[PDB]
Amino acid sequence: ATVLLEVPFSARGDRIPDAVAELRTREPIRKVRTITGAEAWLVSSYALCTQVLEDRRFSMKETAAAGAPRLNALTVPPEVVNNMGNIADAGLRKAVMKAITPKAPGLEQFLRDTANSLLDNLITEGAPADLRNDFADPLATALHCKVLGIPQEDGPKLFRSLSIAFMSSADPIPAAKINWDRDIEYMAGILENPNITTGLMGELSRLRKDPAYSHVSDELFATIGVTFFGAGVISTGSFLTTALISLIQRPQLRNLLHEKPELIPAGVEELLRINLSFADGLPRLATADIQVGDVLVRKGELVLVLLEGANFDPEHFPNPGSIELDRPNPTSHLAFGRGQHFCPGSALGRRHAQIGIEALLKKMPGVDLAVPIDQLVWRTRFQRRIPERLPVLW
Ligand code: HEM
Ligand SMILES: Oc1ccc(-c2n[nH]cc2Oc2ccccc2)c(O)c1
């Protein structure tokens, strides 16, 4: 006898387990057990993943309900799970979206300057260098301080919350509350700080004092700062890091992008498609009985949308494991999700990776791993897959 198949399958972000293709072919929706002991439906084909993400009856908000089957423990207050809904209801959606576009004057030049400075410092210190801790993550942190309008020097402390904040735990995490409350207090202070007049926090600070937003809560304003910093930094840092691994392991592609940097955006789109940064399927709770493939999902059940299931589906992306810059459907991947909860930071995430890679290939065209790839240490029980260190030489 064996127990029910458990998720997640592997914390490794450098290879996809054979089990994914097996499931997709034989049972593209099937029952699994999560780390909490709850059962869930794991969805692994492009067609069924898209169906679930495009049907709001599969609800993000309702995953926070007391007594629901859980993927993992909440690390934020339950009301915050409906973060974008709260922002929308407060009439703040357009303003937030405008503030986080990569098109702000000077933002791209800031990114390039920052990337180049980080790389120069690594070159000065000499190989080996750690491209996660001393390149990808600081670049993400710097970008988000700039986008938020907050001091660069405050980035490191806010960043240190994230190795706990984005845990995927079977049980509640006491440290997550301590850090959350402290970070909320910080953002509340920012809203009252006369020095803060640019970026997302500068804009929220002004809207907060405008009559049309007088009954929007201070808690919501602070929460927007905390969640956008955290989600943005962890997502961009983790994606860039694992994308660099995929690039390093493809010297032919690395050379092509070095020689023809105009191809970098198409390269980054393919790196998004094959990215294994999300450690768990995206969770939704059924609010009705809904047929998905051969399964009638019942009201109250948990569904997990496996992004790499969709993104490596050969029925949608032929030769799915290969990076091919000339696909006819290049942005149709699910790396940023789909539907109601599509990533609001997609443009900024793309630009972060494009500029980081462009800078790295120019400064370190001979970049390569400094340890055998199996020596990378993959973070466990976390909402992202990432190597603890990424040692390179050049
Ligand atoms: C390569 C970088 C990024 C990737 C791969 C990524 C991925 C995703 C995905 C897959 C979702 C959907 C979650 C779901 O439907 O359950 C999402 C949502 C979200 N992302 Fe991103 N993201 C990235 C960058 C960013 C950035 C830069 C920001 C903000 C600055 C951000 C903020 C958010 C927020 C606030 C949500 C919640 C949306 C909602 O609840 O409707 N992300 N992200
Ligand atoms: O400082 C932070 C920031 C974000 C989170 C978080 N945990 N889980 C999901 C998180 O971030 C979001 C982001 C958007 C909507 C809801 C939550 C967190 O646990 C701490």
From Swiss-Prot:
InterPro entries per the UniProt record, alphabetical: Cyt_P450 (IPR001128), Cyt_P450_B (IPR002397), Cyt_P450_CS (IPR017972), Cyt_P450_sf (IPR036396)
UniProt cross-references to PROSITE patterns, sorted A to Z: CYTOCHROME_P450 (PS00086)
Residues annotated to bind heme: 284, 341, 343
GO cellular component, one term: cytoplasm
Subcellular location: Cytoplasm
SUPFAM superfamilies according to UniProt: Cytochrome P450
UniProt main location, coarse: cytoplasm
Cofactor annotation: heme
Catalytic class of the enzyme: oxidoreductase
Binding site for substrate: 75, 83-84, 235, 299, 383
Annotated positions for site Important for the position of heme: 344
Annotated function: Catalyzes C-C bond formation between the carbons ortho to the phenolic hydroxyl of cyclo(L-tyr-L-tyr) (cYY) producing mycocyclosin. Can also use cyclo(L-Tyr-L-Phe) (cYF), cyclo(L-Tyr-L-Trp) (cYW) and cyclo(L-Tyr-L-3,4-dihydroxyphenylalanine) (cY-DOPA) as substrate.
Record family assignment: Belongs to the cytochrome P450 family.
Pfam family, one: p450
EC number(s) reported in the record: 1.14.19.70
Catalyzed chemical reaction(s): cyclo(L-tyrosyl-L-tyrosyl) + 2 reduced [2Fe-2S]-[ferredoxin] + O2 + 2 H(+) = mycoclysin + 2 oxidized [2Fe-2S]-[ferredoxin] + 2 H2O
Residues of the site described as Participates in a stacking interactions with the tyrosyl of cYY: 166, 180
A GO MF label: oxidoreductase activity, acting on paired donors, with incorporation or reduction of molecular oxygen
Name recorded for this polypeptide: Mycocyclosin synthase
Keywords: Cytoplasm, Heme, Iron, Metal-binding, Monooxygenase, Oxidoreductase
